[PDB]
């Protein structure tokens, strides 16, 4: 996020010194990149005690929320985002068959 600004700036300088007839090459405001809400990604009953076919419905609801970005009650989207590989954390106490 912060590291990209460097890359962008060096690349802008090349077009600037190359072409002077066209001046003031546009840039976006800093908050376009700083703001995290703009980008797509950003009372809990104990599931262990539940019946099976209700765990299935709950997990489906959380996954349907997961698909569009942010995570859900029983499954979390890990905030590491190291390198470029996103990872997710399912609740530990589930049925192994559902979990895989």
């Amino acid at each position: 996020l912060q590291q990209s600004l460097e890359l962008k700036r060096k690349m802008l300088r090349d077009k600037q010194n190359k072409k002077n007839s066209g001046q003031h090459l546009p840039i976006f405001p800093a908050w376009v990149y700083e703001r995290p809400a703009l980008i797509g990604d950003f009372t809990a009953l104990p599931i262990g005690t539940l019946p099976l076919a209700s765990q299935e419905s709950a997990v489906v609801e959380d996954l349907l929320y997961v698909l569009v970005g942010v995570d859900g009650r029983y499954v979390s989207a890990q905030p590491l985002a190291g390198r470029q590989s996103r990872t997710f954390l399912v609740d530990p106490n589930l049925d192994l068959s559902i979990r895989e």
Binding site: L96, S97, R99
Partner: peptide, 29 residues
Amino acid sequence: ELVKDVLNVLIGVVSATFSLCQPAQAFVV
């Protein structure tokens, strides 16, 4: 009742298993 598992054993599940392993030594169902 147990048959529900078997229905999903047709697909990959954990109730029954496909341990990616040597047949019948660690490979199991």
